[PDB]
């Protein structure tokens, strides 16, 4: 029922998911001058060498690449985190045009897209239990700007024609998510939420300062995806981003000066 349209979009979500108006909702605007450098924050540890991608899926709100999370093969640790978080999936948010698409903003700047790598805390055993905990999930967010192509993204772009409509999936083995990361792991962090229903307040957000560049041809392929199923009136999967929510009583911390 929920989506990104006039009648079912973000301004409507609170009716089915009242936590939409909660105290720690995501995304937020990152005010770079107000974020506090925290010299106590550790470097982020990203261990993706043994990642096992399984499937690529059009879920009617995004596309996602799913990983084997039945063992500690692709894990996030350190940074603001206590313990070990397993990579479950990555997905994107993007715009109809390059001047919007990101969920987080930086001094009100919107990027063309935002990559989310979703991880869950192994101490809760499964992602369904982790989403019920305030420290259940860690989402690594990476901004996309349009310029030079990202070679590590092309394997993803080239299969999107095979998952055009909602629920369509394909084999997507041997994909290396290290090819989507920028040089720097400098980050901002704050306590927040899932940015789609059920909007659970279970996420430690880690948003990298350095964007990756993708080409216009790569993001154009995102914009050919459809929100609709098969045989239903064609609606381009574009503008699948929630806007910035109130920061309320939260501090954004920077890992860098
Ligand atoms: C399947 C599930 C119930 C148990 C685990 C839940 C997952 C956990 C994480 C996310 C990531 C979120 O996107 S975002 N933008 O916040 O990273 C979209 C929603 C989704 C897929 C939940 C949907 C409902
Ligand atoms: Zn997301």
Swiss-Prot record:
According to the UniProt record, what happens if one changes residue 59 to H? Reduced proton transfer
Give, from the UniProt record, the effect of changing residue 91 to Y. Answer: In OPTB3; partial loss of activity
The activity regulation comment is: Activated by X-ray, histamine, L-adrenaline, L- and D-phenylalanine, L- and D-histidine, L-His-OMe and beta-Ala-His (carnosine).
Reaction(s) catalysed by this chain, per the record, are: hydrogencarbonate + H(+) = CO2 + H2O; urea = cyanamide + H2O
Q: What class of enzyme is it?
A: lyase
The record's cofactor note says: Zinc. Can also use cobalt(II) with lower efficiency, but not copper(II), nickel(II) and manganese(II).
Q: Mutating residue 194 to E/H/R leads to what result?
A: Strongly reduced CO(2) hydrase activity
Q: What else is known?
A: Target of drugs used in treatments against glaucoma disorder and breast cancer.
This protein is called what?
Carbonic anhydrase 2
């Amino acid at each position: 029922h929920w989506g990104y349209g006039k009648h079912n979009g973000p301004e409507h979500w609170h009716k089915d998911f009242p936590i939409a108006k909660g105290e720690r909702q995501s995304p937020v605007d990152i005010d770079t001058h107000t974020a506090k450098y925290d010299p106590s924050l550790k470097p982020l540890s990203v261990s993706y060498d043994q990642a096992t991608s399984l499937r690529i899926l059009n879920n009617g709100h995004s596309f996602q690449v799913t990983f084997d999370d039945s063992q500690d093969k692709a894990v996030l640790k350190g940074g603001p985190l206590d313990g070990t978080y397993r990579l479950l999936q990555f997905h994107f948010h993007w715009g109809s045009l390059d001047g919007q698409g990101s969920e987080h903003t930086v001094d009100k700047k919107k990027y063309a897209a935002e990559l989310h790598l979703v991880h869950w805390n192994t101490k809760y055993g499964d992602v369904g239990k982790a989403v019920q905990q305030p420290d259940g999930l860690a989402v690594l967010g990476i901004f996309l700007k349009v310029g030079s192509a990202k070679p590590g993204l092309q394997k993803v772009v080239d299969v999107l024609d095979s998952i055009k409509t909602e629920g369509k999936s394909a084999d997507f083995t041997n994909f290396d998510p290290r090819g989507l990361l920028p040089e720097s792991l400098d980050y901002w962090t704050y306590p927040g939420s899932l940015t789609t229903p059920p909007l659970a307040e279970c996420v430690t957000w880690i948003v990298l300062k350095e964007p990756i560049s993708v080409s216009s041809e790569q993001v154009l392929k995102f914009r050919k995806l459809n929100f609709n199923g098969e045989g239903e009136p064609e609606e381009l999967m574009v503008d699948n981003w929630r806007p910035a929510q109130p920061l309320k009583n939260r501090q954004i911390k920077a890992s860098f000066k």
